[PDB]
Amino acid sequence: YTRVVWCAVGPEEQKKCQQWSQQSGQNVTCATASTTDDCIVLVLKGEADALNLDGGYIYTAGKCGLVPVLAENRKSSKHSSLDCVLRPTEGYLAVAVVKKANEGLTWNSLKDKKSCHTAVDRTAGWNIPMGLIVNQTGSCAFDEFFSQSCAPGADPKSRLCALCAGDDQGLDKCVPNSKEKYYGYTGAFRCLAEDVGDVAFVKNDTVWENTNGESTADWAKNLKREDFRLLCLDGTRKPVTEAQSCHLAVAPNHAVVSRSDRAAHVEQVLLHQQALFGKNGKNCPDKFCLFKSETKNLLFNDNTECLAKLGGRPTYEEYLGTEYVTAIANLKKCSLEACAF
Ligand SMILES: *[C@@H]1O[C@H](CO)[C@@H](O[C@@H]2O[C@H](CO)[C@@H](O[C@H]3O[C@H](CO[C@@H]4O[C@H](CO)[C@@H](O)[C@H](O)[C@@H]4O)[C@@H](O[C@@H]4O[C@H](CO)[C@@H](O)[C@H](O)[C@@H]4O)[C@H](O)[C@@H]3O)[C@H](O)[C@H]2NC(C)=O)[C@H](O)[C@H]1NC(C)=O
Ligand SMILES: *[C@@H]1O[C@H](CO)[C@@H](O[C@@H]2O[C@H](CO)[C@@H](O[C@H]3O[C@H](CO)[C@@H](O[C@@H]4O[C@H](CO)[C@@H](O)[C@H](O)[C@@H]4O)[C@H](O)[C@@H]3O)[C@H](O)[C@H]2NC(C)=O)[C@H](O)[C@H]1NC(C)=O
Ligand SMILES: *[C@@H]1O[C@H](CO)[C@@H](O[C@@H]2O[C@H](CO)[C@@H](O)[C@H](O)[C@H]2NC(C)=O)[C@H](O)[C@H]1NC(C)=O
Ligand SMILES: OC[C@H]1O[C@@H](O)[C@H](O)[C@@H](O)[C@H]1O
Ligand SMILES: [Fe+3]
Ligand SMILES: [Zn+2]
């Protein structure tokens, strides 16, 4: 039992982490970086111990010796008697969403359209869609496929950032942190919802959580589920209730990574941390709730029921699975063995 230093990405995540720290008796403390990458670096140097990551980043981190410790687990149906922490992870559905009123827009007519991505290097927002788009066009010119986009993490003055609005003053345009108005799952969908983009690459859960009154946020309160449509790969369009038969791919859950020599200790603290601030935690909602950030998915996704033991002590490759790891490899060829820092 020593402290665990968590790496928060951006001002909002550090605010939430500072609250978590205060409520934990400093059992968990914070470190901040303007970027997920920078946070990986801080963990490599040994200045931060852990952070929760999307599959695309687990891959970057894995190449540098970091290892998945616990995964986020959301609501399911299979394995009912099994507890959340021991229950296998279901994965999540990556989808391409559009406005219904945008008739005639299919997967086959996305060229020169306007796209909203969660952030460069992420699973549903970048890796899967651009992976499919490169293969389909047999070209690495993925910077020239759309006319304009908001793909946080790309060059601020390039087309991939043309649609990003930055912040509130307009500063930090395109930064890969929750301060890019259109950063992440929620931001990319808002990008679509406000008709800035024609399509948004998010996950199925995002569409549901921000429509039909589920979100009390200004831009989303009047959002209706039936005004959106998913783009399947066979060229058709289906209602967002058909996600199960109209997705680009099934993605591995976001997971908490840490240096291999610190993993056991990070795991220990965290389990006890959710016993306190998790879904049924002793001090949530009374004092602090670890998985609630208010439709903002800070540190963790708001739909996390709990952090689950992986098991079978995964290396990063088998946690991400073999078909996904090859998909990233091939995409990375465009822009084999080496840590990127
Ligand atoms: C863009 O294009 C890229 C290139 O076309 C795509 O990458 C290709 O992805 C394919 C699918 O992931 C790979 O093909 C593999 O197919 C075989 C079958 O998979 C096996 O399935 C069994 C379950 O029955 C499992 O045991 C295991 O998952 C297997 O991989 C593979 O043959 C197998 O070899 C293993 C050896 O361990 C063996 O266990 C099995 O018996 C079986 O013989 C085969 O080896 C392939 O891995 C392609 O490799 C891959 N292409 C390249 C260049 O490597 C990419 O997906 C596309 N991007 C997107 C986003 O779609
Ligand atoms: C796309 O993403 C959305 C949002 O993540 C998924 O929809 C959610 O799925 C949950 C489980 O599959 C739904 O159930 C929740 O809410 C109900 C409230 O009534 C709770 O009770 C359940 O009731 C059903 C029906 O009787 C029972 O079978 C269950 O056992 C359970 O008792 C339950 O506790 C659970 O939290 C939820 O309604 C829904 N969320 C929203 C806001 O719509 C959707 O499944 C997913 N689609 C695909 C294809 O993955
Ligand atoms: C901070 O960390 C430790 C985790 O072990 C907690 O302090 C322990 O509390 C447990 C449960 O009451 C005792 O069994 C241990 O003996 C304590 N360890 C010692 C000697 O310090 C503490 O609960 C954590 N704080 C919070 C709020 O999670
Ligand atoms: O982490 C272990 C996992 O490895 C994956 O490759 C596989 O798809 C899963 O079935 C599970 O065994
Ligand atoms: Fe993701
Ligand atoms: Zn599928």
Ligand SMILES: [Zn+2]
């Ligand atoms: Zn293994």
